[PDB]
Structure formats: structure tokens, C-alpha cells
Design a protein around this ligand. Structure first.
Ligand SMILES: [Mg+2]
Ligand SMILES: [Mg+2]
Ligand SMILES: [Mg+2]
Ligand SMILES: [Mg+2]
Ligand SMILES: [Mg+2]
Ligand SMILES: [Mg+2]
Ligand SMILES: [Mg+2]
Ligand SMILES: [Mg+2]
Ligand SMILES: [Mg+2]
Ligand SMILES: [Mg+2]
Ligand SMILES: [Mg+2]
Ligand SMILES: [Mg+2]
Ligand SMILES: [Mg+2]
Ligand SMILES: [Mg+2]
Ligand SMILES: [Zn+2]
Lengths: 125, 37, 135, 137, 178, 133, 11
RNA sequence: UUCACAUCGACGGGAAGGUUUGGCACCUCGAUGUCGGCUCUUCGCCACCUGGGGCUGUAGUAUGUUCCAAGGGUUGGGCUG
RNA sequence: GCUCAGUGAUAAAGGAGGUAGGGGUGCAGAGACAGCCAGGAGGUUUGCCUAGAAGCAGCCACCCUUGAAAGAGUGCGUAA
């Protein structure tokens, strides 16, 4: 639910000036990427696969193995899915800056907080 | 352990439980042990 | 194994099975009965096995009527036989049953022994069935 | 279980066995054999009536016939003695000696009732000492 | 709401100090300190009469199961720090023996090597050289656990009953060789 | 404590009795002649007998019912009972023989009356296929 | 297997 | 031996697979061609061995059957298109 | 309103204290389910069979009595 928001802003779909062929979007900085939450059994079920290109070359991680090993890749991999594919897609993907700690070294760029209009996006335990 | 599609109590002391989604039969005697599958 | 003693033509139309049997519906001979829930074709072999099973499990219980019978012929062409040059050889015989049809009737046991017996009988049938009691 | 009709007839039968009797004897039993139950029932039905009953079953049957002062004897398991024919001491005496044999056999005497008066576990000693009709008359 | 377990209140005896912060319960008794967290739905009430009555925030089937569980859990940590828990296992066989020395429990069960077992702080293990082992601890779960780890090394076999068994056990004894 | 079955006025054969209860430390001749003396006091019949023993090897025994099957076999004048009771009837006895067998068996029963014992004997004869009136 | 699949327009 | 369900499981039923023998004729006809070996892989698991288990009509050794498991292994000859 | 299976992409007989509902029928306030305490008897070791069969290898019968209740016995067990 967060990754959709992120995709919208990175793409520029929330500006009156939006154009499909151009980058009007923002930069988005994701912090605390190891505290991201997922519903139900996904922590142990969801499966990140990647394939060498040799036969028998398939590799699989559960979401949790991944999140202990290199947790940024989880959110990068979830947002890249929702960005356009192709030249503009990739060039867009560089605008997503992800950090595992609660601190980002971007203070100079004066980040605003992200607006979230979704109801269900905030989980409570 | 027997494994089969149809698990029923095979006597009075038998008990059908549900473990991690699969239906099991635990009993006093070992032979009556079954798992669904 | 049940079967007709004579017919003129050997070979016969597959037919089509639609609707409900209204006539074989009632239970008019015994007390407890096994009723067909679904539209199917019963070979004489299956009826044999069902009757046998119910009879052996009832044993000390008395009576079993078989309310059906395999009077419609069925034909088959052999293996490695190219299509054409005539309809094949009648191999076996089926009874056509439609939902609601009574198959087995039974009398001379307590309701429990009857339930168990009829269950074991239903196990050898191609179809879903039901346990019913006399009115 | 037991239907309400059978229980009203049971309480009525206990009440009719109560109107004729001049004395009550309360006794509780837990964990004892049926053989000595049947020896005690070789001795008892000759001279006396023995009826084991529930707490409420005794409650509603006793309040009306004015034995009510005996209500505290109904706490715990309840077996009762009513004397229809023979005297009180002939019925009371065998029970205490049977309890002295029942020391390891788990018997206790809760109390007895006579003269419309309640007598505790010890005070029934007098009720044991009373003589037969031949000596009284 | 209608679990016959959650209705029964827990009695905190004197000697038992109960500290409650929000959903986190820390109890300090004669034998030590035990800490637990409650989940969202379970609300445990510490009375004025000195009792613990378990209530629940909502009733989902979830919370029902929860509250039965936690009333018994915290009864076990209360009674656990008060008196404690004793699990006793005896060993059956020729040459089967155990020796507690310092921080180890040494088992000679008929393996090649002596088996060593590091005893956790919370537990106090007493050995009868008469082939009996009693383990005492404030936490039900940890004592049970360790006891099972003992029993694991050589589970009682069917024929002669040999191996480590709990003090009260039905062991199927088949007649071997007839 | 052991249960044995012995004949009325005969005791101490080697195979049936002596070794069996004698391996429990029971005195053979005392039990034998006391059992034969108590059988001589009552009407002589085959006696199933429960003998109770103690740690000091002293023993006390209770003589049970001489079998109602055997007593009703001699009451009907027959030998072998019916192979199929209530189907084939092998004999008939009077109610006086009922009260007689129930009288000899009265100290060995739990019955509080003579009618209960008589109905018990009638039930045993109806069980072995012997008719009663 | 005694059941077929859905090819082309059927599908 | 007792005991349906250790192991077999008759009379019948419900399936999966797509490796056998087939049916079809959608496919290519111009030079889109079948079975064995050599060399060289690779993958599946319905597991022959090797790792861990449950049940046994498992005393032990060795089995039997079944569960998870496809990482590795799976010889050399006489004989055949 | 429902689902907790990532079901939500496909297949059956069969299995099931999954779960949310609906409908009959049992009991109970002289206390129903579960637990716990006790009792579970007499004929009799039923007859037959068998070296033995005593509730409990097998066959037939399966009544009666004392009773709050207790089957000629549901399973284990003994050569019995
Ligand atoms: Mg229509
Ligand atoms: Mg079927
Ligand atoms: Mg196919
Ligand atoms: Mg089966
Ligand atoms: Mg063509
Ligand atoms: Mg070419
Ligand atoms: Mg496999
Ligand atoms: Mg292996
Ligand atoms: Mg194995
Ligand atoms: Mg062997
Ligand atoms: Mg492998
Ligand atoms: Mg491989
Ligand atoms: Mg391989
Ligand atoms: Mg899916
Ligand atoms: Zn079982």
C-alpha cells in the first residue's frame, strides 16, 4: 500500500503538469526499511526468486531471510514493480532512495513528509 | 504412521486433531496413528 | 449378473439421460433404502458387487430387494481398430438411473446395521447416493 | 435422568414412610462395599425402613411433616433411617457399632431426630441405651 | 467470555510482589522475578481483594482462546515464583547413572561417551545416585523443557522399559521373543 | 488367596490340588480334612472353594455354593446339561426341589428371602435348559 | 486422466 | 495362531500422469526424417544406494512397509539391430 | 454479510471438533456435559466344547435375583 503511493509520487501522477513521456516526479526517501510490515503469513511465505540464467540456476528466499540479509532490496523490489518498464522506467527507478536505519544523509535537500491518503496503509498491533 | 486420504477413528480411544492444517489421528496405541495426505 | 435373455437388434443408441425418475421414487417393498442422487449408468457388475456387500454385512438381517436392472445393451470397438466398418460388439449391459431412483431396499435389521450396510453398498457405486427411511 | 413426576412420587413415598415413623437417623457413606450394604439390608428391613435420598428430596419431604429442625444433617451425602414398627434403640444401637467396624470403612453419624427434637452425633448415646418394650411396659 | 478457565480468579499470596506497567507484568516473589507481555485483547484486573480476574477487550474466537491461556500462564508464573516446580525422572537399566557436578549434569546412558548437559541459572538440579533426577525451577516452561531434553537422549524403549522415564509413565511393554 | 474346585468327601490327590495351593505355603492335610469335615456336616456335593491365606501360613476358607448346575442335574436325574438351553429341554423339576436346592444354597447366597433364592435357582435351570414347575 | 482441456474458442 | 487395516487385500468405485500399444489427421513435404552405441549435458521424482524419521507380526543383526529428502552416486564384461 | 486457505489459477470419489449461519430433536434447577470419589454384585466357573474356556478361542442361550446401578459382559490380560 505504501509502494503504490511511492510509485504515484515518483511518477508524477499527482501533479497537474503530469506527462507520460517526461519525468515530472519527486525523489522519495524511504527510511526504516527493516520495520516495514506485511500482513498474514507473508513474512514466512512470500518468495523472492531470482534466476542465474543457467539451468538449475533458480534461487529462492523467504521474505524474512531477505529482510535480515539486505532489507532495502525488499522495498526496491516492490516499488520497481509498479514503475513503468523501459527507459523512462529505469531512469525513474533511480529516484528512489532507500535506507535501513532511521537516518538519511539527505538533510541538505530539505525533505518534506509524504502525504498518505489511504486508510488501510497504517497497521496497528 | 499411516498416511491416507481417509482418516477415521479406528477405535474408542482415538482422537482426531488438527495440526498445522492437516487432520491427524492420535491414539493410545501406536498403530492407530494416522495423518491425512 | 443381471441381463436380458433376448433382443432383436444387438446394437443400440447411447440415448440421453435427463430429468428425474418419478416412478421408481417410492420405497414400496422394504423398510430402509439406498436412493440414487445423480444421473448415471450402472453396469450389472456394480449391482452385483453392491448387493453382495450389503448381503454379507447384513448377514443375520433378512431381506434385500434390488429395484433396478440392466436391460440396455452397450457396444465397444476393439483396440487398434480404425473408425468405420460397422458398430462394435456388445460387451456388457447397463441400467439407466436418474436422480430420485431407488436402487436397494432392505428390511430385517436395526437402523444402525442398516446404515452401515447401505454405506458399504454405496461404496461400490459410480454415483452419489442417499440413505432413506420408509414412510 | 429422573423426570419430575417420578421425583414427586419418590418424595411423597418418603413422606408417607415419614408420617408413620417416630424417629429419624442420618448416615453418610462414601467408598464402601455393596456386600455390607446387603448385610446391613439383611438386618434393617425386618425392624426398620432405610432410604438413601438427595439433599433437596429430603428437604421438601421433611419440612411439611415438621422434622425440619434436622435440616443441617442434609449437608453432604445423605442416607436415612425411619422406624415404622420396632423401637428407636433397637434401630439406633446397630448403626454405631457398625460405625466402630466402619472406622477404616468411612462411616460417620451426622445426627438423629426424636420427640420432634434434634440430637447430634454424641447425644444419640442415650438413644442407644433405651430398653425394649418388654422392659419399658 | 464464557470460558470456565478465565472466570476463575488468581490468588496472589503474601510474599508476592506484583508490578504492573500497562500490558507488561513483572512479578517478584520469594524465588525470583518473572516477566511477561500480554497481547492486545487480554485485560487482567488486579483487585482490591488481592485477586487476579482475567477480562478480554473484545470477543473474537481469538481472544477467547487467548484469555483461557493467559489466566493459566500467569497462575503458573505466580505459583511458580511462590513455591516452584519439580519435574522428576528416573532411569531404568544396567549401568544407567547420573552425576551432577558443578555446572554439568553427566549422564551415563550406555553410550560410548559420557553425555554432558549445561544447566541454566534458573534451574536447580538435585540427583539421587539411586538413579533419580529432580529438577526444580520457578518457570514451568523451562523446567519441563530441560526435563524433556534429558528424556530425549534415551527414550523408554518398549520391551524392557529401559531408558529415562518420567516418574509416572505408562510404557507399552510388548513381549519380545515371546 | 486362591480359588480351587474340589470333590465332596475326597481330598489330597497330587495333580488337582496339593502342588497348586501348596506352592503358596498352605498346609495340605489340615485344609483337606477340614474341608472334608465341613462337607460332611452339610450335604455332600462338589464344592468350588475360595481358600484365603496369610503371611504366617495359617489359612481360612469359605465354602461357596455347590454348583446350582450340578444340584439341578441331580434334581432332574440327568447327567449332561442341554447343548442348546431354552431350545431343547432335558428335564423337569418340582417347586419343592427349587426350595430344597435354595435351602442348601441359602447360607451361600446373598438372598434375603426364600422366594429370591428359588427364583435364582429357577433362572439357573432355565439357563442350562432344565424346565421347572 | 479422463477429462479434456479447453482449446481455442471453447476456452 | 486371536486380530479387516504389520503385511496382503478379492467384488467394485474415484482419480492423476502423458513414458507403452493405440484413435485423430491440426502439423511439414523441396533437402521439417525412425532404434543402438560414442562424446557431451541437462532436468523430473513415482527413492536403487547414501542423510533423517514413524509403524512393525521391530529381542539383536538384518528386514518389511511408509514419511521427508533429487546434494552426490548409480561398475566392468559374455550375448543382441 | 463471509474468507485467513495468498483460497482468490484448474479435477473427483472420500475424509474432517475448520469456520459463519439456519432447522429438527434430547435432557436437565430434586443439577445436564467434562473432570474427580466410590460401586460395578448373586446365580455362576451358563450350557456345549476342550488338557484347560472361569464375561472375554469357538458354538448356543443371553434369563433371573439383590438392587441407586452392574452386559451370562466393551477392551486389555492368564496355560486356565
Ligand atoms: Mg426443470
Ligand atoms: Mg461412489
Ligand atoms: Mg489430459
Ligand atoms: Mg481404509
Ligand atoms: Mg491438413
Ligand atoms: Mg533445410
Ligand atoms: Mg518423494
Ligand atoms: Mg535411508
Ligand atoms: Mg525405517
Ligand atoms: Mg527378529
Ligand atoms: Mg538425491
Ligand atoms: Mg541435481
Ligand atoms: Mg541423479
Ligand atoms: Mg493460486
Ligand atoms: Zn485407536
Amino acid at each position: 500500500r505504501m509502494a503504490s503511493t511511492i510509485a504515484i509520487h515518483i511518477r508524477g501522477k499527482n501533479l497537474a503538469s503530469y506527462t507520460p513521456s517526461v519525468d515530472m516526479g519527486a525523489f522519495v526517501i524511504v527510511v526504516n526499511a527493516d520495520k516495514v510490515a506485511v500482513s498474514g503469513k507473508k513474512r514466512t511465505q512470500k518468495l523472492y526468486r531470482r534466476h542465474s540464467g543457467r539451468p538449475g540456476g533458480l534461487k529462492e528466499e523467504t521474505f524474512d531471510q531477505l529482510q535480515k540479509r539486505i532489507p532495502e532490496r525488499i522495498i526496491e523490489h516492490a516499488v520497481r514493480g509498479m514503475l513503468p518498464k523501459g527507459r523512462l522506467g529505469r531512469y525513474l527507478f533511480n529516484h528512489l532512495k532507500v535506507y535501513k536505519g532511521a537516518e538519511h544523509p539527505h538533510q541538505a535537500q530539505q525533505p518534506i513528509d509524504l502525504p498518505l491518503r489511504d486508510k488501510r496503509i497504517r497497521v496497528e498491533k | 504412521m499411516k498416511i491416507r486420504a481417509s482418516v477415521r477413528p479406528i477405535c474408542e480411544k482415538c482422537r482426531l486433531i488438527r495440526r498445522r492444517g492437516r487432520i491427524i489421528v492420535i491414539c493410545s496405541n501406536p498403530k492407530h496413528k494416522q495423518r491425512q495426505g | 449378473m443381471l441381463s436380458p435373455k433376448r433382443t432383436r437388434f444387438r446394437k443400440q443408441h447411447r440415448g440421453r439421460m435427463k430429468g428425474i425418475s418419478y416412478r421408481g421414487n417410492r420405497i414400496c417393498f422394504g423398510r430402509y433404502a439406498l436412493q440414487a442422487l445423480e444421473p448415471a449408468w450402472i453396469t450389472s457388475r456394480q449391482i452385483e458387487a453392491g448387493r453382495r456387500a450389503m448381503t454379507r454385512n447384513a448377514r443375520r438381517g433378512g431381506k434385500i430387494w434390488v429395484r433396478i436392472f440392466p436391460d440396455k445393451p452397450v457396444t465397444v470397438r476393439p483396440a487398434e481398430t480404425r473408425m468405420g466398418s460397422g458398430k462394435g460388439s456388445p460387451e456388457y449391459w447397463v441400467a439407466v438411473v436418474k436422480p430420485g431412483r431407488i436402487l436397494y431396499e432392505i428390511s430385517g435389521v436395526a437402523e444402525n446395521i442398516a446404515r452401515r450396510a447401505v454405506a458399504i453398498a454405496a461404496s461400490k457405486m459410480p454415483i452419489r447416493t442417499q440413505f432413506i427411511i420408509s414412510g | 435422568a429422573i423426570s419430575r413426576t417420578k421425583k414427586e412420587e419418590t418424595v411423597e413415598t418418603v413422606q408417607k414412610h415419614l408420617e408413620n415413623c417416630y424417629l429419624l437417623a442420618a448416615i453418610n457413606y462414601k467408598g464402601f462395599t455393596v456386600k455390607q450394604f446387603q448385610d446391613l439390608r439383611k438386618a434393617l428391613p425386618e425392624n426398620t425402613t432405610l432410604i438413601v435420598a438427595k439433599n433437596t428430596l429430603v428437604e421438601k419431604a421433611v419440612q411439611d411433616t415438621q422434622w425440619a429442625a434436622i435440616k443441617p444433617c442434609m449437608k453432604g451425602m445423605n442416607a436415612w433411617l425411619f422406624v415404622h414398627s420396632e423401637e428407636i434403640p433397637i434401630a439406633i444401637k446397630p448403626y454405631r457399632t457398625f460405625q466402630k467396624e466402619r472406622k477404616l470403612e468411612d462411616n460417620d453419624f451426622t445426627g438423629a431426630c426424636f420427640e420432634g427434637k434434634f440430637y447430634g452425633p454424641g447425644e444419640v448415646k442415650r438413644l442407644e441405651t433405651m430398653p425394649s418394650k418388654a422392659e419399658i411396659f | 467470555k464464557e470460558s470456565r478457565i478465565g472466570k476463575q480468579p488468581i490468588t496472589v499470596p503474601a510474599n508476592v510482589a506484583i508490578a504492573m506497567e500497562g500490558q507488561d507484568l513483572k512479578v517478584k516473589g520469594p524465588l525470583g522475578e518473572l516477566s511477561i507481555t500480554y497481547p492486545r485483547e487480554v485485560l487482567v484486573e488486579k483487585q482490591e481483594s488481592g485477586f487476579l480476574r482475567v477480562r478480554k477487550a473484545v470477543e473474537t474466537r481469538r481472544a477467547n482462546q487467548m484469555h483461557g491461556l493467559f489466566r493459566t500462564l500467569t497462575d503458573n508464573m505466580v505459583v511458580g515464583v511462590s513455591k516452584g516446580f519439580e519435574k522428576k525422572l528416573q532411569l531404568v537399566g544396567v549401568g544407567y547413572r547420573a552425576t551432577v557436578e558443578g555446572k554439568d549434569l553427566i549422564l551415563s546412558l550406555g553410550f560410548s561417551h559420557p553425555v554432558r548437559m549445561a544447566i541454566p541459572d534458573e534451574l536447580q538440579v538435585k540427583v539421587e545416585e539411586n538413579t533419580k533426577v529432580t529438577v526444580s525451577g520457578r518457570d514451568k516452561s523451562v523446567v519441563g523443557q530441560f526435563a524433556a531434553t534429558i528424556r530425549s537422549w534415551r527414550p523408554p524403549e518398549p520391551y524392557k522399559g529401559k531408558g529415562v522415564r518420567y516418574v509416572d509413565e505408562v510404557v507399552r511393554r510388548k513381549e519380545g521373543k515371546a | 488367596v486362591i480359588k480351587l474346585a474340589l470333590e465332596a468327601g475326597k481330598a489330597t490327590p497330587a495333580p488337582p490340588v496339593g502342588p497348586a495351593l501348596g506352592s503358596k505355603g498352605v498346609n495340605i492335610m489340615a485344609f483337606c480334612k477340614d474341608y472334608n469335615a465341613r462337607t460332611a456336616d452339610k450335604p455332600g456335593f462338589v464344592i468350588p472353594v475360595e481358600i484365603t491365606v496369610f503371611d504366617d501360613k495359617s489359612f481360612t476358607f469359605i465354602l461357596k455354593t455347590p454348583p446350582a448346575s450340578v444340584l439341578l442335574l441331580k434334581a432332574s436325574g440327568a447327567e449332561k446339561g442341554s447343548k442348546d438351553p431354552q431350545m431343547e429341554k432335558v428335564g423337569k423339576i418340582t417347586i419343592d426341589q427349587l426350595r430344597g436346592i435354595a435351602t442348601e444354597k441359602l447360607p451361600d447366597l446373598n438372598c434375603t428371602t426364600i422366594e429370591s433364592a428359588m427364583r435364582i435357582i429357577a433362572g439357573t435351570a432355565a439357563n442350562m435348559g432344565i424346565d421347572i414347575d | 486422466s479422463s477429462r479434456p482441456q479447453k482449446k481455442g474458442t471453447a476456452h
